[PDB]
């Protein structure tokens, strides 16, 4: 009984250590993923803007060439 | 700082020479009609003068110069540039005075909708909704803008954004005591989350909120609603939400404040509650 | 006679609740009329109507014992069709009634 | 002092329950944002492909016309 | 009856240790990797802004030259 | 709403104007021979009217107008733009008419894969399989589409997507088709993951499903495959799945339904089912005699 | 089946048309001087033929067609299309015969480094290292490619890719009885992981492996290295790694082979090891 209870105490202290480590690790998870989500959002916006601008650029350049 | 106010002053002088450019448009462009690029560079100097103003920490002046450049730039050509300038003016006006930011954002919305860009229109609608919520007290306008953005996003199979917009609207409605819309949205989103394995675990909260908004309106239907959620989702009763709800609705059958007061205090003993849920419970359990 | 959709409501008065009669609006029905309340193809329950002025047209009121026996809830939509009792057969000669204390 | 150990074990059990529940609650929303990021990511990928194809064809046609 | 108490205790500790070590080892690699995607998307941003500026200047110069020729 | 009705009215006006524009263009071609600006402008009008119309809450005719514009554009030796418009029209028809969307998506797949792009073709095949299986109750052509998508993905060494598609195909096959293909696919995916940097501890489930399929075939095959998995994967030896399946096999050998019932019930109680293990277990129980 | 056969037949027709095209086009260039459009059309025909060959599941001939198109295009004084064709040929040759895939990928690397770009060069180097490792046994070439890629990554400030390449190189070196280089790389990466708010959790593993590989040499050096590592990282003693190292050190010190084996078995039971670490521990037990 003594050995079993001592082993259980070791197991519980390991429980708290591991769970707290994983918890801090997880808040880091969340922070990093939110930052990446924001910055990909900005990149997607800029992608759409560039696509539209370059499409109208080709359109007007081809129209100008046709004018020649 | 004030070395940036000095260049702000010479940016005002640049706006003055742009006034000279419009005077040229008045008088001298009769012979320089081909100087459309002159008007374009006049708009460019307007825009960079607005940029110097922004760097000078004059938000009102920066927004005014941005909107003036946008107005001078929409000469039936390069409409996208005019829309970008208008949204920049709105961003500049977000701080200080955001009222005209609202109108310029509507103008950008109209430009994009005519062009056909729906994602940008919905995002700007969400932006104006949030500026209303954070600046003004009107929620109805924010609710309408969020619903409209959700409609755009669902029109192009952008389901997640519409789902979140509807979730926010339903939460506000439950706080705004419109329980039919809240229950419908909560059950719809719960069923949608149940569809995919990724959001399979989340259905418990949505079912709980739908059941709460059911139980507030018609107490007897609370039993039927919790039952229906349970067979529809066999792993809903196991959830603490369903057990707690059953405890509250069964205690309410007999008039004993101690029972459900102890229940809610125990529930708060394991996890802190939110303003929405706490206010809901305090309102509902009074009668 | 064919049955029309309505809304289940709560009984307005304690005595009417004790009367065990579905409280209905005068504009929609009459006291003494018998109806069959259908909530689903397999759930039909027969009621006797008692008119009260407070009943809004377009809804039917049931008391809490009635709303528990009949599986009816406030705000729910319920189709009510008039019911005819065969008096040569359905007149209750002797009914076996179980009784118990409602309140402990 | 085994009863004191049992009481401490109960308290630690409660603490573990709270911590695990908080972790699960945050994990659910972590799922939701990963879904959102993937949703946006697919659209940006498709837009990139479209712009690349339009640009290849446009520049090639212009170069051919130049000759 | 303490035998089954010990049996459940050893099962509890065994499963706890293995599963906890699994999570601890697993998360590390993924989150070491996420920074690589972050910096790749940084490079995407840099190249893309340069690309956009390049086309903007090229198109405006082409329009100006075409107007000059006419 | 006034906006919707006005959008629908102006879209009809624009469609009529586009039809008259194409008629006048075919007339002017012989009349004046202006080139091809007229046809491109008519296509532009059609596309603008179609986008406004799909903004107008109406979908079917918007997709039809997009298809017409795409056809007229492809008439001008333009393919990628026409193919993209075809894809958009199919997406619009998704909620209006599945068959038109399916046909447009086939045309887009053919043109794209002829160009040289396989990833878009594979994604379109996955979309076809999803749209078919989600609303139409059938698998076989969905299985074919998943297999084609996996093949296209593997052609460019994109292993993850092809593996996922093959896993889905094998799961559907086991649910409905014979278990040989499912057994082979599950065993392959399980054995190709002993060294997985991040999947070191789930090959057990794949091998367990393969063993369950073996048991659904025959007891002797069940046990032989059970050993094969045991020695092949040492970690699987200590897995709870190993003990559960061995207990189930030894129970089924002796013809005692009670042991099987208690084992399955305990397994369900400790851990939830998956709707696929339960069906196979019930089919096994049906043959206890 | 039928699709593959039809693709192969159409592709054979296209190839025959392509040889006819190249022959008649060179003849017409000689006799009429029509420019270079015909050569470009022939190159595009070759590219489409290679694409349809890959469709037909004939990777050797598809890669041959890609290489032919690359050679023809670079003969036309253009690089990027030639490099893309060469890398596509390598991808086709990746399966079946990768030696010519290796050669064409090396040519692609050569042209890319001639242009001046780094990232693609390092990616191709690591790809060739992977090809050598998976299809060949000459791990030395893989080590050299990893070294070149790591140098490029470190120079371009891409610390993550360089760290990964260095870790792989150290693993391979310590695998082939080389410890000094392995010791240096492992301790360097561990030190690099000191201040990392995230990699700090992983910093211990590199030090543990470094201590083991250093202990492959002698005992006293291992004790000094491990105590130095503990002093550098005060919390390293918290993990089971330090106690395991100390126990193994004393067990080897007092020739307690059975105790060493029992401790290794206990560690394996609590956490299974890999082939490499088990080999290292058995090698340690040999003396």
Cα G21 from chain centroid (whole Å)? 40
| D-G contacts at Cβ under 8 angstroms | 3
- Cα G147 to chain centroid distance, Å, stands at 10
Q: Which of D10, D26, D29, D35 to mutate to test the interface with B (most CBs of B within 10 A)?
A: D35
- Measured CA to CA, the distance from residue F68 to residue F15 in angstroms comes to 11
- The Cα F213–Cα B169 span in angstroms is 48
CA atoms within 13 A on the CB side of G131: 24
Q: Rounded to whole angstroms, how far apart are CA atoms B149 and B109?
A: 11
Query: Is residue G66 within 8 Å of G86, Cβ to Cβ?
Result: yes
Neighbours of F15 (CB within 10 A): 20
Which two three-digit tokens encode residue B211? 């059941």
- CA–CA gap between residue B88 and residue B80 (Å, rounded): 12
- Residues of chain E in contact with residue A39, where contact means CB-CB under 8 angstroms, are 38, 41, 45
Phi, psi angle pair for G58, to nearest 5°: -130, 85
Dist. CA C13–CA F254, nearest whole Å: 68
Select from B74, B73, F36, E60 the least CA-distant residue to A61.
Answer: E60
Helix (H) or strand (E) holding A6: helix A2-67
Residue the block writes with tokens 């992983």: G202
Q: Which residues contact B220 (CB under 8 A, 6 or more apart)?
A: C64, C67, C68, C72, C73, C74
* Mutation target vs C (from B220, B223, B225, B287; most C CBs, 10 A cutoff): B220
Distance of alpha carbon E33 from alpha carbon G161, whole angstroms: 10
As beta bridge partners, residue C50 has: C23
Whole-number Å distance between alpha carbons of C31 and C49 = 5
Tell me which residue has tokens 């569809």: B195
Please give the angle made by the CA atoms of G179, G183 and G189, to the nearest 5 degrees. 145
- Token pair for C13: 């008065």
F120 contacts D49? CB cut-off 8 A: yes
Interhelix angle G200-215/G220-232, rounded to 10 degrees, is 170
Query: Do D62 and A65 touch, CB atoms closer than 8 A?
Result: yes
Cβ pair D40:A40 closer than 8 A: yes
Name the neighbours of D, counting chains with at least 3 Cβ pairs within 8 A: A, B, F, G
Q: What is the CA radius of gyration of chain E?
A: 30
Instruction: Count other Cβ atoms within 10 Å, centred on residue B279.
Output: 13
Q: How far apart are CA G253 and CA G247, in angstroms?
A: 10
The string of DSSP codes covering C10-72 is: E-S-HHHHHTT-EEE-TTT--TT-EEEEEEETTEEEEEEEEE-TTPPTT-EEE-HHHHHHTT-
> How many residues in total does chain C contain?
104
CA diameter of chain F: 93
Determine the 3-state secondary structure of C83 from DSSP: strand
| Residue F91 with chain B: CB contacts under 8 Å | 157
F51 in reach of chain B (CB within 8 A): yes
Question: From residue F9, how far is each of B148, E43, F40, F89 by CA, in Å?
Answer: 21, 47, 23, 21
Would you call F233 helix, strand, or coil by DSSP?
coil
Is D touching C (3+ C-beta pairs, cut-off 8 A)? no
Torsion angle (degrees, nearest 10) of CA F260, F261, F262, F263: 40
Chain E nearest CA to A11, separation (Å): 6
State how far the Cα of B239 lies from the Cα of B219, in Å rounded to an integer: 21
User: Measuring CA to CA, which residue among G72, G144, G158, G62 is closest to residue G109?
Assistant: G144
For chains A and E, count residue pairs whose Cβ atoms are closer than 8 Å. 71
User: Phi/psi of residue F274, each to 5°?
Assistant: -135, 5
DSSP lists the bridge partners of residue C83 as C34
Chain C residues within 8 angstroms (CB to CB) of chain B: 64, 67-68, 71-76
Dist CA F104 CA F102 (whole Å) = 6
CB contact under 8 A, E64 and B34: no
Q: Per the structure block, which two tokens stand in for E41?
A: 């998307």
Question: What CA–CA distance (Å, rounded) separates B148 from F32?
Answer: 48
Chain D residues whose CB is inside 8 A of the G37 CB are 64, 67
- Beta strands at C4-10 and C60-62: parallel, antiparallel or unpaired: parallel
Distances (CA, A) of F31 to B218, C95, F35: 75, 98, 11
Q: How far is CA F177 from the centre of its chain?
A: 17
Gaps in chain C with C–N over 2.5 Å, residue before each: none
Helix (H) or strand (E) holding E52: helix E2-69
> What Å distances lie between residue E66 and A60, A64, A68, E60, E63, CA to CA?
11, 8, 9, 10, 5
**Strand C4-10 versus strand C43-51 pairing type:** unpaired
Contact C74 B220 (CB under 8 A): yes
| Cβ-based contacts of D54 with chain F (< 8 Å) | 80-81
SS (H, E, C) chain G: CHHHHHHHHHHHHHHHHHHHHHHHHHHHHHHHCCCCHHHHHHHHHHHHHHHHHHHCCCHHHHHHHHHHHHHHHHCCCCCHHHHHHHHHHHHHHHCCCCHHHHHHHHHHHHHHHHHCCCHHHHHHHHHHHHHHHHHCCCHHHHHHHHHHHHHHHHHCCCHHHHHHHHHHHHHHHHHCCCCHHHHHHHHHHHHHCCCCCCCHHHHHHHHHHHHHHHHCCCCHHHHHHHHHHHHHCHHHHHCHHHHHHHHHHHHHHCCCHHHHHHHHHHHHHHCCCCHHHHHHHHHHHCC
Q: In 3D, which of G138, G103, G106 has the Cα closest to residue G121?
A: G106
B68-72 long-range contacts (CB < 8 A, ≥24 apart) are B69/B43, B70/B104, B72/B39, B72/B42, B72/B43, B72/B46
To the nearest whole Å, the CA of E28 is away from the closest chain G CA by 7
Cβ neighbours around C104 below 10 Å, total? 4
| Residue C85 DSSP SS3 | coil
User: Burial code of B159-181, b = ≥16 C-beta within 10 A, e = fewer?
Assistant: ebbbbbbbbbbbbbbbeeeebeb
Question: What are the beta bridge partners of residue C48?
Answer: C34
Helix (H, G, I), strand (E, B) or coil at C91: coil
**Residue C96 CB burial class (10 angstroms; 0-12, 13-18, ≥19):** exposed
Q: From the list E9, E48, E62, which residue is nearest A47 (CB)?
A: E48
Q: Chain E partners of A17 at a C-beta cutoff of 8 Å?
A: none
Half-sphere exposure of F100 (CA within 13 A, CB side): 21
- Beta-carbon-side half-sphere exposure of residue F228 (alpha carbons within 13 Å): 15
Q: Who's near G195: CB < 8 A, 6+ residues apart?
A: none
CB contact residues (below 8 A), chain A span 26-45, against chain B: 45
Name chain B contacts of A56, Cβ cutoff 8 Å: 80
Q: Do F157 and G94 make contact, defined as CB atoms within 8 angstroms?
A: yes
Measure CB to CB from residue B218 to each of C64, C71, C74 and give the nearest one.
Answer: C74
Question: Which chain A residues have a beta carbon less than 8 Å from that of E44?
Answer: 43
Specify the DSSP class assigned to residue C78: E
Phi then psi dihedrals of residue C51, to 5 deg: -85, 135
Contact G262, G193 (CB under 8 A): no
For chain B, the DSSP string reads -HHHHHHHHHHHHHHHHHHHHHHHHHHGGGT-TTTHHHHHHHHHHHHHHHHHHHHTT-HHHHHHHHHHHHHHH-SSS-HHHHHHHHHHHHHHHHSS--HHHHHHHHHHHHHHHHHT-HHHHHHHHHHHHHHHHHHSS--HHHHHHHHHHHHHHHHTT-HHHHHHHHHHHHHHHHHTT-HHHHHHHHHHHHHHHHHSSTTGGGHHHHHHHHHHHHHHH-HHHHHHHHHHHHHHSTTSSSSHHHHHHHHHHHHHHS--HHHHHHHHHHHHHHS---HHHHHHHHHHHT-
* Three-state SS at F76: coil
Declared resolution, Å: 4.0
* F180 to B145, D18, F173, F191, F214: CA distances (angstroms): 55, 47, 9, 16, 8
- From B263's Cα to the closest Cα of chain D, the distance in A is 17
Experimental method: cryo-EM
* Total residue count of chain B as it appears in this document: 287
CB atoms within 10 A of CB F278: 13
Using CA atoms, how far apart are residues G11 and G53, in angstroms rounded to an integer? 7
For residue B127, give both structure tokens. 């932006």
| Phi and psi torsions of C46, nearest 5° | -100, 135
State how far residue B240 is from chain E, nearest Cα, in angstroms: 23
Alpha helices (runs of H) in chain F, residue ranges in sequence order: 2-31, 37-55, 60-74, 80-94, 98-115, 119-135, 140-155, 159-175, 179-191, 203-217, 219-232, 234-237, 240-254, 257-270, 277-285
Please name the helix (run of DSSP H) or strand (run of DSSP E) that holds residue A41, with its range, or none: helix A2-67
Asked if F139 and F172 count as a contact pair (C-beta separation under 8 A), the reply is: yes
* Residues B177, B181, B186, B189, CA torsion sign: negative
Nearest 5°: phi and psi at F198? Answer: -125, 0
Give residues with Cβ within 8 angstroms of G26, minimum separation 6.
Answer: none
Report the SS3 class of residue F189. Answer: helix
Rounded Cα gap, residues F36 and G160, in angstroms: 54
Of B53, B55, B60, whose CA–CA distance to B14 is shortest? B53
What is the C-alpha separation between G78 and F212, in angstroms, rounded? 58
- Min Cα distance A39 → chain G (Å) is 19
- Within 8 A of B84 by CB-CB distance, chain A residues are 49
What is the nearest CA distance from D5 to chain G, expressed in angstroms?
24
Residue C41, number of CB atoms within 10 A of its CB: 6
Say if the Cβ atoms of B270 and D21 lie within 8 Å. yes
C48 phi/psi in degrees, rounded to 5: -110, 135
Question: Could you tell me if G270 lies within 8 Å of chain A, comparing CB atoms?
Answer: no
Tell me which chain F residue has its CA closest to the CA of residue G272.
F235
**Cβ-based interface (< 8 Å): residues of G facing D:** 35, 37
Closest CA to G186 of G168, G167, G172: G167
Burial (CB < 10 A; 0-12, 13-18, 19+), residue A1, is exposed
Instruction: For residue B84, list its beta bridge partners.
Output: none
Token pair of F120 as six digits: 């878009």
Gap between the Cα atoms of B199 and B210, Å rounded: 17
Q: Are strands C77-83 and C34-40 parallel, antiparallel or unpaired?
A: antiparallel
Tell me which residue has tokens 């669902």.
B154
């Amino acid at each position: 009984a003594l050995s079993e209870i001592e082993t259980r105490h070791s197991e519980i202290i390991k429980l708290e250590n591991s769970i707290r480590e994983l918890h801090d690790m997880f808040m880091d998870m969340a922070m990093l993923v939110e930052s990446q989500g924001e910055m990909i959002d900005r990149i997607e916006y800029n992608v759409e803007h560039a696509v539209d601008y370059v499409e109208r650029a080709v359109s007007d350049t081809k129209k100008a060439v046709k004018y020649q | 700082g004030m070395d940036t106010s000095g260049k702000q002053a010479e940016a005002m002088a640049l706006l003055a020479e742009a006034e000279r450019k419009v005077k040229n448009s008045q008088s001298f462009f009769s012979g320089l009609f081909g100087g459309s690029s002159k008007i374009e560079e006049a708009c460019e100097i307007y825009a960079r003068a607005a940029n110097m103003f922004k760097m000078a920490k004059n938000w009102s002046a920066a927004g005014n110069a941005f909107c003036q450049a946008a107005q001078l730039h929409l000469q039936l050509q390069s409409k996208h540039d005019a829309a970008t300038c208008f949204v920049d003016a709105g961003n500049a006006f977000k701080k200080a005075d955001p009222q005209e930011a609202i109108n310029c954002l509507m103008r950008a919305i109209e430009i994009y909708t005519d062009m056909g860009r729906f994602t940008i229109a919905a995002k700007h609608h969400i932006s104006i909704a949030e500026i209303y919520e954070t600046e003004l007290v009107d929620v109805e306008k924010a609710i309408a803008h969020y619903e409209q953005s959700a409609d755009y996003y669902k029109g192009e199979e952008s389901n997640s954004s519409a789902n979140k917009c509807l979730l926010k609207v339903a939460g506000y409605a439950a706080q705004l005591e419109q329980y039919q819309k809240a229950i419908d949205i909560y059950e719809q989103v719960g069923t949608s989350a149940m569809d995919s394995p990724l959001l399979k675990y989340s259905a418990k909260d949505y079912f709980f909120k739908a059941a709460l908004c059911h139980f507030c309106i018609d107490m007897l239907n609370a039993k039927l609603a919790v039952q229906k959620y349970e067979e529809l989702f066999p792993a809903f009763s196991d959830s603490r939400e369903c057990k707690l709800m059953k405890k509250l609705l069964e205690a309410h059958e007999e008039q004993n404040v101690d029972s459900y007061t102890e229940s809610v205090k125990e529930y708060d003993s394991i996890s802190r509650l939110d303003q929405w849920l706490t206010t809901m419970l305090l309102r509902i359990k009074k009668t | 006679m064919a049955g029309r959709s309505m809304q289940a409501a709560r009984c307005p008065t304690d005595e009417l609740s004790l009367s065990n009669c579905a409280v209905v609006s005068e504009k929609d029905y009459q006291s003494g009329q018998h109806v069959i309340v259908r909530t689903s193809p397999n759930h039909k329950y027969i009621f006797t109507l008692r008119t009260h002025p407070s009943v809004v047209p377009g809804s039917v009121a049931f008391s809490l014992p009635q709303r528990k026996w009949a599986g009816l809830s406030i705000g729910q939509e319920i189709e009510v069709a008039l019911y005819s009792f065969d008096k040569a057969k359905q007149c209750i000669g002797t009914m076996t009634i179980e009784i118990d204390f409602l309140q402990k | 002092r085994a009863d004191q150990l049992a009481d401490e074990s109960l308290e630690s059990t409660r603490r573990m329950l709270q911590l695990v529940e908080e972790s699960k609650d945050a994990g659910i929303r972590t799922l939701v944002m990963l879904d959102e990021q993937g949703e946006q990511l697919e659209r940006i990928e498709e837009g990139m492909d479209q712009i690349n194809k339009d640009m290849k064809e446009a520049e090639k046609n212009l170069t051919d016309l130049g000759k």
